[PDB]
Write a protein that binds this ligand. Structure first.
Ligand SMILES: *[C@@H]1O[C@H](CO)[C@@H](O)[C@H](O)[C@H]1NC(C)=O
Ligand SMILES: [Zn+2]
Lengths: 597, 195
């Protein structure tokens, strides 16, 4: 009515200003990233300040329009997204206190140092020395003391700060009409709109629980296969009927289990598949990898790269008097400009990373036609799910045979397939329960449920109950173990990885069944299939306009997530693990303690 | 002979904005279509009411050339019977149009690193424009019941806005130059003819 026209005019002006402001800020950011200099950092600072101020002013002024008065099914979502900027709805003193404590925690995590008892002269840092010794060492004592020193130095300095950060975050969440901060994080997945696709926040927990109940039967089997192998290197310590030590998992926090591969590889007779020698012999170039990736993307019917992609984006290290921080990234600067930044080298890992980044760029191009406030993904995990499925399709042996790196007369062996499946399982199934448990612990601690004096005890009780990791040393309540992770200390969410892991296999199975394939699911390719490209592009262009349930139904045909595709993917590995593990036992007991006599 | 001047309309250094387009009338001269094909690309070349194939036999009384600069995506909006922003607030064509529309890229001349902010377009208007009508008024728009009283603010907006082109934008946001030729045959001696 009278207010719809006003809302439409306000949205038009907001979009018109925001497009230019965001483009200016993004251009300044890319200019700084391309060449590091104090001038570039300054220009980035004044570029971001104006954008933040304009966004704050627009959010403040947009509250004059009542939500219930309007009804357009498209204006309402934009106004709701714009108004949800209540991070400033606190008294200024608390804002300064929270900002200062966040900066203090981040800085103290960055500057963390641990020294040796024998000689205080070395004082190894985290990136130079702790990661390598936690990844490729064998001695028990060195890992034990490094772990203990890191945990002590982190917890004893981070516990009191976290105890007050929690209270201020709860106050901030309550000031925005939310139950607690966990609800604030869970509010990303809520989907309201057309009937039948409504999704509430409180369901997000329960569904996750159900999914875990179908991951446990497989994961336990893996826990057996490593354990026996881990008894070969360390005979006396690890017990057949117990859990695994925290510092023997191959990583500082035990998040991933990839580094255990050289010790738990099944067959030593033949190595894995590496076509780097073929690239070296055939005289490949950095541009050739991206050309092949673009050819693969075109083969399914997706649009090709813009003619500014090659001219503007950098794909090779400058190799001269220029400073660039090395990290593969895809940039959507706005106004129809797309770039990829990568320190390309001739190696298969860079090839797969290029596939991932090109998938990101394709998704960004796909959702471009939508308005500015709805120019995002449906949820957190869709970008990474798309990248992962593209990489999985690109890494198959038959695709390599088609390219020409592998010889035409190839005799694929089942043992290589088992090795590849074991590597994939160690990458994914090893990290899923850790993510679930950390997210559950944070959710419980934010809801004023776990008491202030029983944090670490409950943390290790859950760690011993769910994942099956036992502490080698006892920790007093003064310690703060969860603060040792980057995401916990720097205030990032963590369930997006779980959601992306669930989503990617559903997407892969849908694209494979749409590609007319039979047989094992780990040899499938979406290439040379216009139907799969059409099915994907029907969803890639929706963006954030509608509920993610509709997009999921468009892709796979289900309203909610499911975990069966992962089990179908890993079925041969499950069979082999059951075959191998007849003699040993399955499961762990919580009674064991290594330090206890 | 006396050739029609198809040079000021196709080789001009500067083009006017959308909301104030340039109109030139020509008569009593000699028109040649060979000069028109002066640029290779011709991204858009669409003719209504006349044969796109070479037809110089027909003689008209007045020829109107309307020139302006728009974006790439709006080129499809310069057509008879279209709805949009440019076609409803800036430049409108009638349903009985008999002419030709030509649009070609101009990125190499109308794009600067800092940004060319001279080009403008109108964003708010009370009522749709009648065909072949221009508006150059800059009063403050008023979408609310409260009187604006000559000052911007809440529910008060300034109509005109700027493009701000740059030489890294995409092909859809790059500057394009558009010229429209309209042919009118009134009750008068025939003036415009062929060679
Ligand atoms: C006409 O166009 C071409 C562009 O290269 C050139 O002859 C000249 O710059 C322009 N202006 C004239 C001829 O006055
Ligand atoms: Zn990615």
């Amino acid at each position: 009515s009278l207010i719809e026209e006003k809302a439409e005019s306000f949205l038009n002006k907001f979009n018109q200003e925001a497009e230019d402001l965001s483009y200016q800020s993004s251009l300044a950011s890319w200019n700084y990233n391309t060449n590091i200099t104090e001038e570039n950092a300054q220009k980035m600072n004044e570029a971001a300040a104006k954008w933040s101020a304009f966004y704050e002013e627009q959010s403040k002024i947009a509250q004059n329009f009542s939500l219930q008065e309007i009804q357009n099914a498209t204006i309402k979502r934009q106004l709701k997204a714009l108004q949800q900027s209540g991070s400033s709805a606190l008294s200024p003193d608390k804002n300064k206190q929270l900002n200062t404590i966040l900066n203090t925690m981040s800085t103290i995590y960055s500057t963390g140092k641990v020294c040796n008892s024998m000689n205080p002269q070395e004082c190894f840092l985290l990136e130079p020395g702790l990661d390598e010794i936690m990844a490729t060492s064998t001695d028990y004592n060195r890992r034990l003391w490094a772990w203990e020193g890191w945990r002590a130095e982190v917890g004893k300095q981070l516990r009191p700060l976290y105890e007050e950060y929690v209270v201020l975050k709860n106050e901030m969440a309550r000031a925005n009409n939310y139950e607690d901060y966990g609800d604030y994080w869970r509010g990303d997945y809520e989907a309201e709109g057309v009937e039948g696709y409504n999704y509430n926040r409180n369901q997000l927990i329960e569904d996750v629980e159900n999914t875990f109940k179908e991951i446990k039967p497989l994961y336990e089997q893996l826990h057996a296969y490593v354990r026996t192998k881990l008894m070969e290197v360390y005979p006396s310590y690890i017990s057949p009927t117990g859990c695994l030590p925290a510092h023997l998992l191959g990583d500082m926090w035990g998040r991933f289990w990839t580094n255990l591969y050289p010790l738990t590889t099944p067959f030593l007779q033949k190595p894995n598949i590496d076509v780097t020698d073929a690239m070296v012999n055939q005289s490949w170039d950095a541009e050739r990898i991206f050309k092949e990736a673009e050819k693969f993307f075109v083969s399914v019917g997706l649009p090709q790269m813009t003619p500014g992609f090659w001219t503007n984006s950098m794909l090779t290290e400058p190799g001269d008097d220029r400073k660039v921080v090395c990290h593969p990234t895809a940039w959507d600067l706005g106004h129809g400009d797309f770039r990829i930044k990568m320190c390309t080298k001739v190696t298969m890992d860079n090839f797969l990373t290029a596939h991932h980044e090109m998938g990101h760029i394709q998704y960004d191009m796909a959702y471009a036609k939508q308005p500015f406030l709805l120019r995002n993904g449906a949820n957190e995990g869709f970008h990474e799910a798309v990248g992962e499925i593209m990489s999985l399709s690109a890494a198959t042996p038959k695709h390599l045979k088609s390219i020409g790196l592998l010889p035409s007369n190839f005799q694929e062996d089942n043992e290589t397939e088992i090795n590849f499946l074991l590597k994939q399982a160690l990458t994914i199934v090893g990290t899923l329960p850790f993510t679930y448990m950390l997210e559950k612990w944070r959710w419980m601690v934010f809801q004023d449920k776990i008491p202030r004096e029983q944090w670490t005890k409950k943390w290790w009780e859950m760690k011993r109950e769910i994942v099956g990791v036992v502490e080698p040393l006892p920790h007093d309540e003064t310690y703060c173990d969860p603060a040792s992770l980057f995401h916990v200390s720097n205030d990032y969410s963590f369930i997006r990885y779980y959601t992306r892991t669930i989503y990617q296999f559903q997407f892969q199975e849908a694209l494979c069944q749409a590609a007319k394939h039979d047989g094992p699911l780990h040899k499938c390719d979406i290439s040379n299939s216009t139907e799969a490209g059409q099915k994907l592009l029907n969803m890639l262009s929706l963006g954030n306009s509608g509920p993610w349930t509709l997009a999921l139904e468009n892709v796979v045909g289900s309203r909610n997530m499911d975990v069966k595709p992962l089990l179908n993917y890993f079925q041969p590995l499950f069979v082999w693990l059951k075959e191998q593990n007849r003699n040993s036992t399955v499961g762990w007991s919580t009674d064991w303690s290594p330090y206890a006599d | 002979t006396n050739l029609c001047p198809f040079d000021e309309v196709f080789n001009a250094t500067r083009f006017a904005s959308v909301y104030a387009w340039n109109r030139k009338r020509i008569s009593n001269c000699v028109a040649d279509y060979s000069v028109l094909y002066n640029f290779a690309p011709f991204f858009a070349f669409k003719c209504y009411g006349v044969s796109p194939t070479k037809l110089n036999d027909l003689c008209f009384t007045n020829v109107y050339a309307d020139s302006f600069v728009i974006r790439g995506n709006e080129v499809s909006q310069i057509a008879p019977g279209q709805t949009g922003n440019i076609a409803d607030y800036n430049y409108k064509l009638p349903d009985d149009f008999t002419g030709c529309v030509i649009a070609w890229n101009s990125n190499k001349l109308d794009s600067k690193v800092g940004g060319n902010y001279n080009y403008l377009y109108r964003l708010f208007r009370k009522s749709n424009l009648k065909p072949f009508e221009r508006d150059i008024s800059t009063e403050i728009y008023q979408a609310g019941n409260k009187p604006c009283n000559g000052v911007a603010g809440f529910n008060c907006y300034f109509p005109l806005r700027s493009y701000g082109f740059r030489p890294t934008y995409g092909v859809g946001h790059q500057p394009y130059r558009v010229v429209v030729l309209s042919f009118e045959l009134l009750h008068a001696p025939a003036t415009v003819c062929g060679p």
